[PDB]
Each structure stands twice: as structure tokens, then as C-alpha cells.
Amino acid sequence: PRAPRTYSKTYSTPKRPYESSRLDAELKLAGEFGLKNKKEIYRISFQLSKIRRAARDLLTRDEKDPKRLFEGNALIRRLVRVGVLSEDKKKLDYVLALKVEDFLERRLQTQVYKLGLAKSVHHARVLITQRHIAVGKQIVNIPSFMVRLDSEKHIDFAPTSPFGGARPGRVARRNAARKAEASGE
Amino acid sequence: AKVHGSLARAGKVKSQTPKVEKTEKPKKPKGRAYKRLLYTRRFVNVTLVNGKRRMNPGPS
Amino acid sequence: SVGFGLVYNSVAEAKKFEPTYRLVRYGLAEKVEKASRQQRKQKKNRDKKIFGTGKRLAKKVARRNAD
Amino acid sequence: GKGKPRGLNSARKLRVHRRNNRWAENNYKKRLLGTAFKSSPFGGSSHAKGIVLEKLGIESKQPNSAIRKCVRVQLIKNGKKVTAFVPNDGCLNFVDENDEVLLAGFGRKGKAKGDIPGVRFKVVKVSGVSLLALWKEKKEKPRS
Amino acid sequence: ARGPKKHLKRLAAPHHWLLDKLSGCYAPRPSAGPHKLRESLPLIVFLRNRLKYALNGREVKAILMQRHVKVDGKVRTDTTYPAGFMDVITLDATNENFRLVYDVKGRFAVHRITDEEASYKLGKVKKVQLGKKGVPYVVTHDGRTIRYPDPNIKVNDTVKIDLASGKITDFIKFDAGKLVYVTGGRNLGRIGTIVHKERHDGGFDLVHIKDSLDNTFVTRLNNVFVIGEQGKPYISLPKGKGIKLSIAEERDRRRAQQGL
RNA sequence: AGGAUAGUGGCCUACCAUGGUUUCAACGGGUAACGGGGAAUAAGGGUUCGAUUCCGGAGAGGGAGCCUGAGAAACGGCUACCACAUCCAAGGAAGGCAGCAGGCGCGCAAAUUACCCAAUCCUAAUUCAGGGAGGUAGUGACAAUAAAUAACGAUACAGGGCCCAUUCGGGUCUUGUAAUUGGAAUGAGUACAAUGUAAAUACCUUAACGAGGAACAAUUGGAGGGCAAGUCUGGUGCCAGCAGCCGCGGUAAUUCCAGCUCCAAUAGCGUAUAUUAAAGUUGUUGCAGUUAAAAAGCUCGUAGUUGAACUUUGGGCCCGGUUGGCC
RNA sequence: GGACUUUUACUUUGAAAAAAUUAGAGUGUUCAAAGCAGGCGUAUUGCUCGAAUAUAUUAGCAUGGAAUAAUAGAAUAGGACG
């Protein structure tokens, strides 16, 4: 006896398991964005499915419907806040047209790579997982973080990272110790 | 509808298969690195496109 | 790090309102010596079987076994 | 009016007609008759346990020609006798007789598979050990 | 079964207490008292969850056992004491006075009053009847039995109770145009004036109420509580005054006063 | 009418009357039925499930009966019987885990005889006592969230280049290959400590240790079609086996047994059973009935369903909310 | 309070339909599943936003409408008006 904790699945798997077109398009997304799974693509497609469904029944409602206005503005605000939907094209007809590439563009792994700072998406991910990037003053080690368009200018190297300062790194320290051992004092 | 056929030959082909041990080879990367390998192998290193592409060619 | 703080207007009211476990944390109290929860419950259930002080029962048991 | 009634007040007729005609469906008939619990070797369950009574060599249906290596099993919870296929190259050697075996259906919801006549169960485990683990040598049967 | 229930499972408590889903299997079960269970606010919920003066029930009991809190001028050491609508809560320490009035979201609000306001409460007349020895009396919404009421007082009227002596100071009739407060249903917390009252003899008299901005709503008479004349309430209303903004305009003022 | 009950009432009794339900499905039978809030799937309509965190109900091995009490037909109350069963000195006496933990049994099928009242609350004469209620930890790949198993250089050949690289240089630009080669980076793990906690475990944080085959080595299924992925090599020769289904296997087996390579999903992936979609193969939306399954041989006919048209229209006036439309 | 009441289906609005759950508003639980938190100073003696909203089907309740579909009315006038 206690209130159940709520949980949800964040992905769906596709309908036909083996479509060469979908398999190629998914692998191209994984390669271009440095993803680990097809589940990473599936999770985005699942998020589009919920967003597109919500926008869909809102558009079924006529204009100036209080619910269509209120919820449609909140959905537009959130997607504009996260950068998936442009600052213009602020409409439900335009949130209906959003793609998986729009969401993958806003991952921290992509943004760490595109703001210099990583020289690769795979480099960006390992730097992220290894606690080298702080989105603000907060270290973020999740590559799917959804930078929200106000944090872009705050993304930088973690202050407690050897790429940020205050420590030259564990392996560099051991190697410098060996050199001191061989050389002297 | 006989149910009492000969059972002496069970496991014949498997037990008489010449045993060969797997050849040790360098490990493949796991995870995001393997998908990276698959992406370069199929979309950047694309050289043989027989039909549309080829993936396990036989010797020829 | 983020936590919670209490400042009392004197030590005595701190000892009045603070939980025992926090006072033991600060050395302001002593962790009372009590038996295990199972031991207390078993002792209570054993003493339920005695009516009165029970020293009459002990006297009779001693005398019956002696004679 | 193409048959069925269309009046706004014909709900009783339509629901009763649907009730009558759902008995023509296999699944609805079986579920509402409770035939899995009543007339089925597994009493409606997904798996069952039994004891190997004897090893059988079943001659496969034409045009195939093979000995399919099944076992007669007596189920612990029912006492019913079933025939279970023993799947792999060998693996009949692992089964022996008087050993307990975990049986499963095969996937055709009844309806004996392939070329194996009258066999609708397959051995999954023997003596508490997976046939797959025994076949791939990952594990051994407990002799004692 | 077999007798009265003593526990209140969390997820079965009144929603307006705003108790968290997790961190507990149970909720404070209000004691028997002046207000109904679903319409009450236990003292532990008020002191701990609303006023944050106590971190847990043990501190709520510690506060109450020193006789700081008082409901309608009496100490009420009970932890689950069922304080309700228009109850006056006094804390002699902090010199603080509260009246339990719902905000416009149908929840008890932390509403502060002065000492002069805390000197009295209002009661809705639940019944008027002759007691033994033929002595008339009124019964209010908080269970108060008040002997020798003014004969003009009927049911659904409101009385001003001295709360030092259990005495009526004056009263308000139930007539069209009088300010009322919604104490139940889905319009709980709204304030407006009676437009008219439709009878429905045999069951459920209804009341038509419009607020300041001419928004009309219909509520059962059981939920309607007279609180004053046209304007000028006899109690100090909470912030909002029961206007019931829509969510769009609610959001508009959120973004207005959050950006200065 | 009386009795009984807290009280209404065939609840019961006496007398009296002959009523009451039912093809709009009574009565009976079944249920691998507790009901609901809900759950799964689903374009819409639907289909299946709901023992189970909340609400209501019922029960405490099966029956019945009763005491105390405001409240129980109470079972961690009693009485009796039935079933099971413990102790015994044989005289007797004591029982009820569908509370928690735990055992047996049953089975395809489900965890510790742990710690604590610190929290949530509840009870009591009560701030204090108690609470296997509850919380904490243990087992736990039920389900769910996030997401390591590498990243980056230099040396090898690609080549897409320009002044007709003439035949290649030019400070071209290295995406891919050299079981090379370099220094960086980090947590899995381990621990000073602090934090955490009722006390701890863990998490979060953190000093010192912690990758070169970074052996700190990811699996599960597959590679004829459906259906993404070999006609490569060795084995076997209608055998062994595979194969949901169509089909493979009888000496070139892309289908078996293996090695190599490849594909799919991936800390998960298969198998069985059930159920939903697919199923417009249950059909209201929305099926079919000449010949594929299906128009009763034919007519009458009750219940059901369905059932032609017609009764104040038209014109006018006034109030009067909404978009912008013109500083 | 009536020399005062044709009945019904249907539809509109309102209300009611516990909480959890579903959809959904807000909020950087480091992300997310979640949760109902939190945020801002002058951290010198505290200031402040929230914990929405919708759906919840049938039956019952109140209400507007009067198309559709039934029903009733004055024929031995035992009719209405007064």
C-alpha cells in the first residue's frame, strides 16, 4: 500500500523489422550523429509521434478555441525554446512538419561538436560521458541533453575538467611522475 | 504411423563433423564505435555497389 | 551542497525540540542502551504469561521442585 | 437494406445476431468453451513438466524421409501422455528415460509442426538443464 | 466494517490538502469535530504543509502541546483537529491570526487577519428549531448551537459569532444581490452576488451568482455561503477575491509580473 | 392485526385474498466471475483484460451459535459440531499464517525466519508507550529511465583537385588500411574522508590506486523466400538434421553440422502460451450468401423492427455581441 | 399559494461523475522515466510564483430549443369561451 510510481516507455519500435530504406536511413542518422543504438532514433521518432498527435487534434479544433490557443502556444513555445522549431514559422502547421534531424541537431553531443570544442561527434560524446562539458556551471554527462537555445552560449569545458583546469589529468600525472622518476628532482 | 524407428544414428553428422577451432582475431568495437564502423563501411567506404550495394561478396 | 539548518534561541530549547538521533549526532545526548527489537518483544510476550509479580509463582516452583 | 436491420431501435437484434455468429470463430468458440482448460494436454498453460516414458523414432511425413526422435512423456500435473520432439543434432542422447523434461508447445497453437506426425510439443529442458546448454556444451546433466 | 475507520490512506485524502503522492502511505485522518472530514483542514496539515512551521508530525505535536495554536479561541492540542471554513487560527507566538478561507482554486489559503477580525467568525445557519422548554436555537455550519436566536433568522442566513461568548452579533439574510462565497462543488472559492434563487421544491434549490466581471454560474444552495452585502464583506477576503481567471489570462499575468 | 427489530418491510406469526415474474429471455445451468476506479492494443468504431498500490464487498479450515461492547454474528474472542492436527506421565490439556518472515506441498510460475519506529500515520490515561501498520536494507534481467565497452594524433596507399600534377612534388590535405606507433581522457572496480542514514548499504561528491590484446575481450538470433544478410570453404549423402509456412537434405547442400565473412536488434536477444493490431477472416461504422460457405420448398402469422403526406410560412421594425478599415 | 397543468424521445447549456491513472499547463529531477516542486534577493534577520486545465460517455438532476419521430385532443358533443 502506497501510491504507485508512474513510468512510461520512451520509444516504439518500427512496424516492419527489415526495410532496407529505413535501415539505411537509420544508419545514416546514427553515423552522422554518432548514436549508439537504433533506439536513439526510435526515441526521437516516438517524441515526434506524441508532438504530432497533440498538434494534430489541436488543428482539428477550430481557431480561437481556448484549448487550441492555450496548448498550441505552449507546444510552440517549448519547441522554439529548445530550438527544434525555428523562431519564425511559429505555428501548429509548422510543428507538424518537424523531422528527426531537427531534434538530433539539438543534442548536447551535436552542439558540443558544432561549437568547436570536440572536432567530432564521437569525440563529443566521449568528452560528454567523461564529464568534460558543463552546460552552464553544471557538468552534464548525458549526450541527449536537449540544449534549450539559452544554454548554447554557456556550453564550455567543465571547471573541474583537465580541459577546464585545476588538474592535469590522471594519466598525464602518472606519466609526468615517471619522467620525474627517470630524470630526478 | 510407426513410432519405433531406428534410434541408433542419432547425432551422426554432428559427431562425425571434422572439428575445427575458431581463429582468434582482433575484437570488434562495441556500441557507438561499431555503428561508426558500419557507417563508414556502407556509406563512406562505398566501393562495390553491385545492383545498389554489396555486403557479403563471395570470392570471385 | 544543499541542506537544511536549524538555529535555536538557546541550547536548552535545542535539547527540548531536536530529535534524539540528531543530539546523539552532535554529542549532546547518548545513544540509550536498549535491547534488540526482537528481544524486547520476546521479553514482553514472556511476561504476558505471568499474572501478578510472579514471585509467588517462583516460590511455588522452587518448593515443588525441592520437595 | 442489404440484410441486417437498420432501425434506431434494433440494438437488441444486432447484439444478439453478433452473439450468435461469434460462435463461428475458432478463437471465440475455444475461449468461451474453455477447451484449453478442459480438453488439452497442458491445462491451458504455456509449459508443462513430465517424465520420459520411452524414446520414439517417428518417421516423418512424405515427401520428407527421416527419423524425428521424439519421447513419450507423462505429464506430472495431468498424467496425460504426450509425444514431444527433441530438437537438435543428437540431443536424444541427453534425454534418456525416467528423466523429468520441461515441454513447450511449438508455435502452431496445437497443430503438429512440419513433417512430424502427431507431435505438438518439444523438449526445452531435461533434468532441470536446457537442451540448448547441453547441446552447446555450456552445462552438464546432474548425474547424482 | 464492524465499526468506524481510523485510517486515511494517502490518495484517499481530500485533494485540496495538496499532499504529495509519495513520502507516505497515509494522510492525517481528521478527528471528529466541527467540520466534515472532506471539508476540513487538520491542524497538522495547516502547521506543517501550509505554514512550514513544522517539519514533521512530531514537531506539529510539539507545537500543539505547548498550547500555542488555538481554533476559534480554544487551544486544541489535537493534531488532527478538523478546522474548516471560516475557522480562526491564532498563534500567540508570532502574534499571527488566520481565517480559513478557500482561494479561488478550491483550496484553503494562508490568509492573515488582524486581531479585530480574529475576534469573530461567521456561521451559516444550518437549522432553526425549538429545543426543550420551547427554547429556540440555531445551528451553524461549524456545529455551534446558539440559543435564543433572533426570530428573523432563517436557514441559509449568516450570523456573526462573538467567538469569545458564543453569541450572535448580527446577521445577513439570503436574498438576491447579497455577496456570497462558494463553499463546495467545482466553483469552490468563487465570490459573487446572488442574482436569484430557484426553488425546486422537493430537492436541490439552486443559486445564480455573478462575480465582479459579470461571470455567472449556477451552484446548489448547499454550497452557497452569504458573506456580506453588495461589496463590503464582513470578512477580509483573500487575494483574488474569487474572480476565477481563465488559464490564458492566468498565464498572461504570470508572464507579466514574472518579467517585472 | 400482532410480535420481533434500532427502526421500515412476510422479517416472523395468526387470519384473509390469489397473487408475483417471464420470448423486452423469467426460472435454470456455466464462469479457468469479487465489482468499480482502471489496463493492453487501437485511424475511427471496437477487442481483450482488471486476483493485485485507491474505493466498496466478502472471509479467516468448513458450518452454525453467542458474550462483551457505541460498534463484531469478531475469529492473533468464546461455544459446539465436522475435517485436520500438537502435547501427555494416558488422567488430561492446547489449536487455526487468506498478518510479517519462514517451511512443506502444488505446480511453467513468485524473495529475508534481516534492521527500525527516524518518516507516514494510527491507538492508548497518552508530547514520552506501542504499532512485521509502515519505513529501511536483502533477493530480484517482472516492467521502466538514462546509457561504457573508446576518443584523438603522426607514418603507410587512396586520390576529387590547379600551372595541360609535365610523369608524382607545390607546405595537396588523410574520410578509409599498416594484430603498427604516441601521448592524452575517463569511469567499471577499489578506498582516506565527508555526505547520506534511526544506524547503516548505496547514490551524489571525493584524496590516493585503477587499460594497451585498452584479456577491463557483448550477446542473442539469423544469412533460399517471406525478411536484412554468402551460391565462400570443409563435412554428411532422404542419414543426421533443418524448416512457424513454402520448403532444404538422395555426392557442387547459398537451408543440415562447422570455419570464415555478413546481417538484425543490442545489455539485451530468442523460445512457448495467451491476448490486441493486422481481421472489412464477426461487419454499427463495415463482410458475404447465382456459380467459391451461405436465400428456409412455400405461404399465413404473433412478439420485434420498420412505416406515405399534411397543421405559422413569409415580410417588416428595434435592440444588439464579434475582425478590421484607415491619428 | 390556483376556476393549473397532454405525455415522450432527441438535442443545448449547467452541475455531477473521489484520488491515483489518461491527455495536458508550469518547473533544467545534470537528461529522462519521474516528482510536485521550486524561484529570487539585500542570505544583514526573507520576499515570492505554483501544486492548473480538459476528458470522464449510460442513468438520475436543473436548463434552453421545438426541427425530427411518436403520442393526446371537440363526433350520440358529456366541447371551449363567460
Ligand SMILES: [Mg+2]
Ligand atoms: Mg436480419
Ligand SMILES: [Mg+2]
Ligand atoms: Mg478491515
Ligand SMILES: [Mg+2]
Ligand atoms: Mg407491521
Ligand SMILES: [Mg+2]
Ligand atoms: Mg472465484
Ligand SMILES: [Mg+2]
Ligand atoms: Mg475488477
Ligand SMILES: [Mg+2]
Ligand atoms: Mg478486482
Ligand SMILES: [Mg+2]
Ligand atoms: Mg482466484
Ligand SMILES: [Mg+2]
Ligand atoms: Mg468478518
Ligand SMILES: [Mg+2]
Ligand atoms: Mg489455509
Ligand SMILES: [Mg+2]
Ligand atoms: Mg467468528
Ligand SMILES: [Mg+2]
Ligand atoms: Mg491468525
Ligand SMILES: [Mg+2]
Ligand atoms: Mg483480526
Ligand SMILES: [Mg+2]
Ligand atoms: Mg507469509
Ligand SMILES: [Mg+2]
Ligand atoms: Mg518469475
Ligand SMILES: [Mg+2]
Ligand atoms: Mg513512527
Ligand SMILES: [Mg+2]
Ligand atoms: Mg506489509
